[PDB]
Every structure is written in structure tokens, then in C-alpha cells.
RNA sequence: UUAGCUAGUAGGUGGGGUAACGGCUCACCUAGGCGACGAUCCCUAGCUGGUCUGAGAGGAUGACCAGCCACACUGGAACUGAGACACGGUCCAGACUCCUACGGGAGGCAGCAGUGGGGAAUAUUGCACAAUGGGCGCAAGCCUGAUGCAGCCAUGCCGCG
RNA sequence: UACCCGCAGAAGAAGCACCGGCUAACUCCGUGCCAGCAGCCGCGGUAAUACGGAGGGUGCAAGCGUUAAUCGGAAUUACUGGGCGUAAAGCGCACGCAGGCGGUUUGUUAAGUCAGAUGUGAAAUCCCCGGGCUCAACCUGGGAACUGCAUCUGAUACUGGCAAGCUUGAGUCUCGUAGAGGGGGGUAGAAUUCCAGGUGUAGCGGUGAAAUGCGUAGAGAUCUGGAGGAAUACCGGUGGCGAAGGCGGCCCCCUGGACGAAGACUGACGCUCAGGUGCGAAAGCGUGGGGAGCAAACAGGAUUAGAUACCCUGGUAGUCCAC
């Protein structure tokens, strides 16, 4: 059902980016904040706010160029049916280093560019292309 | 198509 | 390749991919045919070469190179098949029928029209006559006396009784004969009583229905008389191909109607709806039976329903 | 288109056993053991370091080199010895061949070549212990068809005219 | 022996395959869908660069072609990296074990994973830089590689386990609404056929046209009355309900799910499903009933070349109920 909420998060982002929606909302969690805050610090989105404490509701502000999709495509990589893990030297790049790959490690959620100075590996979340 | 299907039986090579 | 002696021989049968060719002495020798051959029938004299035996004494086939000219030919057209010749090079046809399952008269009439276009003399032969009574035999004899006034010889035989086989053989020597008929009319049984042929195959005989007949034996198989001549078996045929010529030739397809032409009122006549038809007056007189006259315009009304779509050779 | 298999089987006691632990073996006691994560049955196959193909992932295979296991006419058994259930040791049986005075005996080329035969198809019935390795001996020395060589086979690669 | 000196003279030392396209190279003659050619496409019956030969050329080379075998091309068993409305493919549907997977918050474990280190992954092969044999093949130095496994120390974001939770997932109650949902038992009135009676007369019936059939024992038609059987006009509609096949007169009884409103309440109790389990149009089968109408086989008459089918008059099984 909602068994991969990160894939449910990526579904709501990709639809509203293409359908010219100004802002979207979604149910919040601890992990969804730890991904959207990275995308805010990597120029893909604008802002995120939390609403509700017994029903945590996350909001995202979209981002356009002249009405053109900033996040062109995003690809869920690991999944509950098949887990994907890499080492500190097998971290894949997205568009030969243009896009970023969201990898969650023990030092928090960061990119593969940020994992070079960290020197760790773990679970690939999504290819932010 | 599902990876979990191929755990029970792999792809049948002719 | 590597063919043998060009010589003249008689083709026994036809099998599509190959054919059975009898030599000049009585040797059964199967041969295939040339790609440029347009048609090959049963009992057609050909030019052929018997290949070359690979093993000494054991040959597989030869080839049939050329086809000689036809004396006669039996061409009958068909829907979506075209005009196809069945047999050729013959002098006499023997129409063979039986009282079971049916004895029709319209099956008799259109072989008469065909034989007038081939200059061949057909002979009416009835089989299975032992199953009727003398009241029934006299009525069928009365129906065949009409076919005796018109000049055709009528011999009424039976295979399981051997009646009248000896007068049937006297007029049949020295000629080849097609035993034409419908399905299950006693064609193969009369082949057994006349020839004395090899009883180890002796035929395929399955004709068992509720009120119908089955055509078990195939197109034509060649054999020889003890005196002289050849036999040609016929399929069980229920077809009538009249795509050949004009209905002026239908007037020529009947014997006694020759001498009554040029006697009607007009120079052209349909002979059904025209007032003063002298042919129709001859039927009303009783010199021509009305069974033949009603079947005659049934032939003409059959050409009103066969002609409908179109067919041309 | 193999779903149930298994009674020395699974476990325990005690005795015996081997160089060592152990149903390895024996009496007794218990009824468990294995198995849809493929037991069991059938068919096929020496395995691996590798070779080849492929951008890679994979795929096919296991000749020459090296490692290990099995086997030495077929089957079974034990002795000897530190080490074998023993390729050129023995014993028994079977199969085949040879010798014979008819009663008996002899033999194991999957060692080097080589013959017969099979198959589309694969070699000289060669030289040497000079070197290397090994065996024996205090060493000298001897032995080694391992190996070092040579010939044949355009069989492959590479180089030249 | 390699190696080296010296002698003589181009003297001793080049072939095979192809030539329509794929695929590098074009003309001529002979032959006449014959002979042949060929991996594919397909060439050749009177002008064939495709057959045969000649001329000339091309591609290779002391080798060149052919055949057989493996992988690649083939993303043509698709993990990387395929599809299932109609090209091959979503079980007829449903329940559900094992199995896979799982909301959200905190703590804990450090299992999975990640970081570091140790031991090990024989040599040879392959790769990197070298050396040597005149060169190359080949031989060889060291390094890398062998993406493996085991152990130890760490990090705790995610997955897993434990612990405590939370409510939006999924459930529970109440008040209600709609429905051909199923099963069981009654009941209604047309229509069909049969039977009884009455009035009434020469055809009825059937088809394109006729015939079989029925009827002066009075058919048919009409009316009265009765019996039996099966189905429910109109309502009735891309209308409703049910997991699906399906389900239709009315009424009662038993009973299943669906949906809406307002709150209260349990606290992930969930999704999914190989075997397994049940339902499942009609035909058909077993046993015993039942019998109008319709109707395989079959009977009869037209049709026809034959009619087996079509058309018509009849008619058994079956259609009905229980098991
Ligand atoms: N009682 C009787 N039966 C006969 C007579 N002649 C032939 N029959 C039977 O009729 C049947 C048909 O004979 P058959 O010759 O096979 O007929 P056909 O016409 O050759 N058939 P097909 O069309 O297959 O070739 C056979 O069973 C045969 O025994 C006869 O005179 N009397
Ligand atoms: Mg016959
Ligand atoms: Mg013990
Ligand atoms: Mg060797
Ligand atoms: Mg070895
Ligand atoms: Mg041994
Ligand atoms: Mg032994
Ligand atoms: Mg030996
Ligand atoms: Mg040998
Ligand atoms: Mg041989
Ligand atoms: Mg070209
Ligand atoms: Mg050629
Ligand atoms: Mg020419
Ligand atoms: Mg060379
Ligand atoms: Mg092949
Ligand atoms: Mg592939
Ligand atoms: Mg496809
Ligand atoms: Mg299809
Ligand atoms: Mg379905
Ligand atoms: Mg602590
Ligand atoms: Mg090594
Ligand atoms: Mg090394
Ligand atoms: Mg090396
Ligand atoms: Mg060099
Ligand atoms: Mg957790
Ligand atoms: Mg009624
Ligand atoms: Mg509570
Ligand atoms: Mg039955
Ligand atoms: Mg019927
Ligand atoms: Mg029944
Ligand atoms: Zn006239």
C-alpha cells in the first residue's frame, strides 16, 4: 500500500513539477524531512514547512525556470522488494556527476559528493537527475 | 518481471 | 537426370507427383512428369524414359517427357477449379448405374449431351437388379425402353447374379471404356465379374449410408480385358459442367430431337413459352415421352442458375 | 511426467575398535531422524586455479601448465611397511589369450613408443643421463621412456625472403 | 649448435578465394527455369556483371577457402537490460497457511549494511612498468589485481529484533438508506397445449411457391368450464446488486455483503499469495420423479445433381425438480 513512503514522496514531486503546480503537500515523517532538507540545500526545491503534530503534514514549494521543470526526472533506486547498498568507492554518479545521488549513512543524509570527504557508504535513496 | 519471482525459479534458458 | 530410352507407352494412373506408366509389354513402372506438362490423364500414350537404375536391377522412377495428341478428351468444368480434363483417347463410354441408392434420369441426360460433343457412343448399364421384384423390374424396363427407341443399347446386369455379362462383353472388346456413374452404383463390383483380375487387393469397397452412396474408389485405375481393350473406372460424380457452348448445342445433345428440328413455327424458338412448337407437339402426340421434355427445359433452366456469377476458361 | 524417505536408520548407556574423535562395531534403551530453503529416486559429469567470448554484468567449457580426488583387465579381501587396502606386490573368483608331454601353469601397454581395430581425424617400434629433479650409498659411482633432446604432422602463433 | 667470415649470380624460393546486394571489385561470350548456382534475398524459358568460360580487378598471403563446434551480434529467458487491451502471454473467481513485504514516534541491540585493521585468497595466466633472446612470438623481475572469506575495533541514518507508544492504514458500535444478493415455502393472472360442453361450416394449417399433416367422427374460429407444465409483458433504462458465472410476477420467513451521517473505541491488528479449499454458464452422466411448449437423433414432405443441412408438418433424449 503505502509501504514505500519515499516512493510515494517522489510520486507527488514528479507530478506537480510537470503539471505546473505551485505547491504540494504530503504526510510528514522524520526521513522525509531528512531528504527534502538536502534538496533545499541543493537548489532543487525552495522551502518546506511542517503542519500538525498528531497528523504530521509536510509541504513543499515547487521551482521552475520559465515554467520549465527544474527536477526533470527522479528515479527511486532501492526499494522494499530489493535493497541496494554500495561501498565508499562504488558510489554511482548521476549524469556523470551532474545529478546527485541521495545516500543515507551513519553521519546523516548527504550526497555522493559530500560522501567523498566523509568516506562512507550505505543505502542509495534516489537519483536526483 | 518481479525479482522476488525469480528467487523461486530463474529465467529458463532454452 | 540420366534418363533412359525414349519410347511409347500407356499411362496407367495419375498421382500428381508421379504417374504409373505401362511399357510396350506389360511392365508396371512408375514415373514422374515434366514441369512443362499442362495435363496428364489416365490412359494417355506418352513419350517417356525410364531413368537409370542406381542399383543393378533396382530402379526408383523414370520421367515422362512428352504427351502425344488427343483422340478424344473428357473435359468437365467446375466452380473455382476451371475446365479440367478427366480422361482422354477413348472410343466408347459405358454409363453404369444402380437402382440403389437412387436411379435418376437427369444423371443420364447430360452425359448424352456431352457424348454428342465428343462423337462417343454411351451405353446404359443398370446394376443391383436382383433386389427388385418382377413388378418392379418391368417398370424399370419400361423406363429404359424410352432409352431404347432413341438408339442407345441398354443392357441390364447384376454383379451378384452374373446376368447378361456375356452380351455385355461382346460389344465391349477392342475398345476402351469409362464406367461412368454416381457414388456407390456398383462400379467396382462389375470390374470383378468381367476381368477375373488379381483378387489380392480387388478393390476398395465401402458404400454404406442411410439412403445415400459413398465414393470410396479414386479417379481412374487402368486394367486390360482378357480379349482386348482397356477399362477406365470413374469417381462417384455428382457434377454437371455445361459451361462449354451455346444452348444451340443443347439441341444437338439429343438423338430423336435432331429429326424434328426445322418443323416449328419460328426460325428461333425457346420451345417452352412459344406458341406452336412442333417439338412440343411431338411430346403431346406421345412419340416423345414427357419425362424427357420436362427434363429438357430443366437443363435450360439450370443454365439460368449456373450462369449467374460468371465462369470462363 | 521423482513427495514422502530411512531400523544400525536418529540419539543415549556400556563393551570392543583405529594413530586420532565418532554406530566405526556389538548388546541394551529411546522413537526419533531427514524433507518443499528439494529429502529420496533417475540421468549426466572429475573438480578448481583458468581458457575463450563479451563494454561490463554474464555466458560456454575444464586439452596442454599447476593443485587435489578417484582409478590401474572385472570383482572381493588381507598382509608387509612410518606411510597402500598397493599401476610394473601377493591371494581368491570370473572373463580373455598364450605355453603344455593334458595333469597343469603364464599374463595384465589408462608408462615410453608401436601394431590391430574404431572414427572425419592426431607421430619415431629415436638419442642421452650433458644439465635439472628424484632413488641408493660415506663418497666415487649406478639407475631414472621423469626430464633434457631430435624426427614426423604448414597443427597454431610469430619473423623473413 | 646459435652466431660470424668468404664465395657465386636475381640466380633456389607465390598461391588461393571472390567479383547482384549484404560486402571490396564490370564487361564479353556460351547456355535457355534445362543444366547448374546458393549462407540469406532469390538468379537463369532468347540481352544472365548471379550458370559455364574468357578478359580484367579486388581481398588475403606461405598459406588460402570450406565444414563442424562455442560465445558475441541476440535487450532473442531482458539482475544490469523485455513484455502480457487486440502481435505469444493476467489462472473463471474467491478465501487463506507457509513465504515475501509493511504507517508513524522514542529507546535499545548492533543482526543486515558501511568504515578501519589483521590473517588469508599457492604459483603460473591476464593487467602496469621493466629486462633478455638480432626482432616478434616467447621467457622473466617487481607491483597491481584476485571485486573472496574469517576475526577484531568502530559509527547508528536506513532495514531487522526487543521495549514503550501514537492514530491518518485497517477494524468495532449506534442511527439509517438503496438493491433482480442467495436459500426455503405459498400465491396471482395472461398465453400455450390437452380435455369437456355449446353455437357454427369447408376448408384449416403452412411457404418464395407448394406438399406432408389435420378436418364433415364437425376441424379451424368463438364462448363456457377444468386440468397440467414452464416462464414472468408493460414497468425497464451503457439502470441496480453480487467475487465471478450470473441474478427479474407478488408476498412472507431465514440470511449475506455494500454505502452514508454523527461521535465513541482497539492500536498496524495490514497488503499479497505457490500448494491447499470452495464457488463456478450451458451441454453431458448416475438414481428417482415430471412433461405443456420448444427441440439433437430420427419420421415425413418440398428443395436439389444428391438434401444428409436450409424450409415446412411431427417428434424422443434433454430442457423441469430432488439427490
Ligand atoms: N445385391 C447386389 N449388390 C450388389 C450388386 N452389385 C454390386 N453390389 C454391391 O453394391 C455395393 C457397391 O459396389 P461398388 O462397386 O463398391 O460401388 P462403386 O460404384 O464402385 N462405389 P464407388 O463410387 O466408391 O467407386 C457393394 O457392396 C456391392 O457388393 C448386385 O448386382 N447385387
Ligand atoms: Mg468403386
Ligand atoms: Mg561408545
Ligand atoms: Mg605431460
Ligand atoms: Mg592433473
Ligand atoms: Mg586406493
Ligand atoms: Mg587393487
Ligand atoms: Mg603395467
Ligand atoms: Mg601412450
Ligand atoms: Mg574403422
Ligand atoms: Mg561495391
Ligand atoms: Mg562459380
Ligand atoms: Mg542470352
Ligand atoms: Mg606467416
Ligand atoms: Mg552452426
Ligand atoms: Mg541476450
Ligand atoms: Mg519483446
Ligand atoms: Mg494474441
Ligand atoms: Mg477474470
Ligand atoms: Mg549505551
Ligand atoms: Mg598465483
Ligand atoms: Mg609472481
Ligand atoms: Mg607474468
Ligand atoms: Mg624489444
Ligand atoms: Mg526500527
Ligand atoms: Mg393458460
Ligand atoms: Mg487509546
Ligand atoms: Mg445418460
Ligand atoms: Mg430439427
Ligand atoms: Mg437427466
Ligand atoms: Zn419450337
From Swiss-Prot, chain A:
Pfam families assigned: Ribosomal_S8
Keyword Transmembrane helix: no
Gene3D superfamilies: 3.30.1370.30, 3.30.1490.10
GO BP: cytoplasmic translation; regulation of mRNA stability; regulation of translation; ribosomal small subunit assembly
Cross-referenced PROSITE patterns: RIBOSOMAL_S8
Keyword Ribonucleoprotein: yes
Physiological role: One of the primary rRNA binding proteins, it binds directly to 16S rRNA central domain where it helps coordinate assembly of the platform of the 30S subunit.
Family statement drawn from the similarity comment of this UniProt entry: Belongs to the universal ribosomal protein uS8 family.
NCBIfam families membership: PRK00136.1
Protein name per UniProt: Small ribosomal subunit protein uS8
UniProtKB/Swiss-Prot annotation, chain B:
Coiled coil (residue ranges): none
Function comment: With S4 and S5 plays an important role in translational accuracy.
Family indicated by similarity: Belongs to the universal ribosomal protein uS12 family.
Subunit-structure text: Part of the 30S ribosomal subunit. Contacts proteins S8 and S17. Interacts with ArfA. May interact with IF1 in the 30S initiation complex.
Miscellaneous comment in the UniProt entry for this protein: At least 19 substitutions or deletions in 11 codons can promote streptomycin resistance, dependence or pseudodependence; all but one of the streptomycin resistant mutations (K42R) are associated with hyperaccurate translation and thus reduced translational efficiency. The streptomycin sensitive allele is dominant to resistant alleles.
Protein name: Small ribosomal subunit protein uS12
Origin species: Escherichia coli (strain K12)
Lineage: Bacteria, Pseudomonadati, Pseudomonadota, Gammaproteobacteria, Enterobacterales
Recorded name of the encoding gene: rpsL
Shown residues within the full chain: 2 to 15 of 124
From Swiss-Prot, chain C:
Matching Gene3D superfamilies: Nucleic acid-binding proteins (2.40.50.140), P-loop containing nucleotide triphosphate hydrolases (3.40.50.300), Probable gtpase engc, domain 3 (1.10.40.50)
Alphabetical GO biological process terms: ribosomal small subunit assembly; ribosomal small subunit biogenesis
Cofactor comment: Binds 1 zinc ion per subunit.
GO molecular function: GDP binding; GTP binding; GTPase activity; guanosine tetraphosphate binding; metal ion binding; rRNA binding
Enzyme class, UniProt record, top EC level: hydrolase
Amino-acid positions noted as binding Zn(2+) in the UniProt annotation, renumbered to this chain: 264, 269, 271, 277
Keywords from the named record: Cytoplasm, GTP-binding, Hydrolase, Metal-binding, Nucleotide-binding, Ribosome biogenesis, RNA-binding, rRNA-binding, Zinc
Region of interest (Required to remove RbfA from mature 30S ribosomes), residue spans: 287-313
GO cellular component terms listed in the entry, alphabetical order: cytosol
Region (Necessary for association with the ribosome and for stimulation of GTPase activity by 30S ribosomes): 1-80
Every CP-type G domain range: 71-240
Entry keyword Lipid metabolism: no
EC number: 3.6.1.-
Binding site for GTP: 127-130, 181-189
Family according to the record: Belongs to the TRAFAC class YlqF/YawG GTPase family. RsgA subfamily.
UniProt comment concerning the protein's domains: Has 3 domains; an N-terminal OB-like domain (about residues 1-100), a central, circularly permutated GTPase module (residues 104-270) and the C-terminal zinc-finger domain (residues 280 to 350). The C-terminal domain has 2 regions; the zinc-binding domain (residues 287-319) is required for binding to 30S ribosomes while the extreme C-terminus (residues 320-350) helps remove RbfA from the mature 30S subunit.
Role summary: One of at least 4 proteins (Era, RbfA, RimM and RsgA/YjeQ) that assist in the late maturation steps of the functional core of the 30S ribosomal subunit. Binds the 30S subunit contacting the head, platform, and rRNA helix 44, which may assist the last maturation stages. Removes RbfA from mature, but not immature 30S ribosomes in a GTP-dependent manner; 95% removal in the presence of GTP, 90% removal in GMP-PNP and 65% removal in the presence of GDP. Circulary permuted GTPase that catalyzes rapid hydrolysis of GTP with a slow catalytic turnover.
The protein, known as: Small ribosomal subunit biogenesis GTPase RsgA
Source organism per UniProt: Escherichia coli (strain K12)
Gene: rsgA
Amino acid at each position: 500500500s503505502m509501504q514505500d513512503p519515499i516512493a510515494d514522496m517522489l510520486t507527488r514531486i514528479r507530478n506537480g513539477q510537470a503539471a505546473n503546480k505551485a505547491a504540494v503537500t504530503m504526510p510528514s515523517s522524520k526521513l522525509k524531512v531528512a531528504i527534502a532538507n538536502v534538496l533545499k540545500e541543493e537548489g532543487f526545491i525552495e522551502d518546506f514547512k511542517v503542519e500538525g503534530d498528531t497528523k504530521p503534514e509536510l509541504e513543499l514549494t515547487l521551482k521552475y525556470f520559465q515554467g520549465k521543470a527544474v527536477v526533470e526526472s527522479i528515479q527511486r533506486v532501492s526499494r522494499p522488494g530489493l535493497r541496494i547498498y554500495k561501498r565508499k568507492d562504488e558510489l554511482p554518479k548521476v549524469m556523470a556527476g551532474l545529478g546527485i545521488a541521495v545516500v543515507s549513512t551513519s553521519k546523516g543524509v548527504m550526497t555522493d559528493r559530500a560522501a567523498r570527504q566523509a568516506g562512507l557508504g550505505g543505502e542509495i535513496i534516489c537519483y536526483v537527475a | 518481471a518481479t525479482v522476488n519471482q525469480l528467487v523461486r525459479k530463474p529465467r529458463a534458458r532454452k | 537426370n540420366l534418363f533412359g530410352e525414349p519410347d511409347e507407352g500407356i499411362v496407367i494412373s495419375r498421382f500428381g507427383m508421379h504417374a504409373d506408366v505401362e511399357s510396350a509389354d506389360g511392365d508396371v513402372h512408375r514415373c514422374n512428369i515434366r514441369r512443362t506438362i499442362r495435363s496428364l490423364v489416365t490412359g494417355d500414350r506418352v513419350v517417356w524414359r525410364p531413368g537409370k537404375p542406381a542399383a543393378e536391377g533396382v530402379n526408383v522412377k523414370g520421367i515422362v517427357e512428352a504427351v502425344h495428341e488427343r483422340t478424344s478428351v473428357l473435359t468437365r468444368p467446375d466452380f473455382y477449379d476451371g475446365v479440367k480434363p478427366i480422361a482422354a483417347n477413348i472410343d466408347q463410354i459405358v454409363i453404369v448405374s444402380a437402382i440403389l441408392p437412387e436411379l435418376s434420369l437427369n444423371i443420364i441426360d447430360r452425359y448424352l449431351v456431352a457424348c454428342e460433343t465428343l462423337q462417343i457412343e454411351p451405353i446404359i448399364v443398370l446394376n443391383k437388379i436382383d433386389l427388385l421384384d418382377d413388378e418392379g423390374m418391368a417398370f424399370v424396363n419400361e423406363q429404359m425402353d424410352i432409352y431404347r427407341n432413341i438408339g442407345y443399347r441398354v443392357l441390364m446386369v447384376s454383379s451378384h447374379t452374373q446376368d447378361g455379362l456375356k452380351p455385355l462383353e461382346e460389344a465391349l472388346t477392342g475398345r476402351i471404356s469409362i464406367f461412368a456413374g454416381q457414388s456407390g452404383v456398383g462400379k467396382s463390383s462389375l470390374l470383378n465379374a468381367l476381368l477375373g483380375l488379381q483378387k489380392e487387393i480387388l478393390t476398395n469397397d465401402i458404400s454404406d449410408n442411410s439412403g445415400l452412396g459413398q465414393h470410396t474408389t479414386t479417379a481412374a485405375r487402368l486394367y486390360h480385358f482378357p480379349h482386348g481393350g482397356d477399362v477406365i473406372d470413374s469417381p462417384g460424380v455428382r457434377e454437371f459442367g455445361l459451361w462449354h457452348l451455346e444452348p444451340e448445342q443443347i439441341t444437338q445433345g439429343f438423338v430423336e430431337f435432331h429429326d424434328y428440328l426445322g418443323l416449328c413455327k419460328y426460325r428461333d424458338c425457346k420451345h417452352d413459352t412459344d406458341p406452336g412448337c412442333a417439338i412440343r407437339e411431338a411430346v403431346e402426340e406421345g412419340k416423345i415421352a414427357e419425362t424427357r421434355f420436362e427434363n429438357y427445359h430443366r437443363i435450360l433452366e439450370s443454365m439460368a442458375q449456373v450462369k449467374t456469377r460468371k465462369n470462363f476458361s
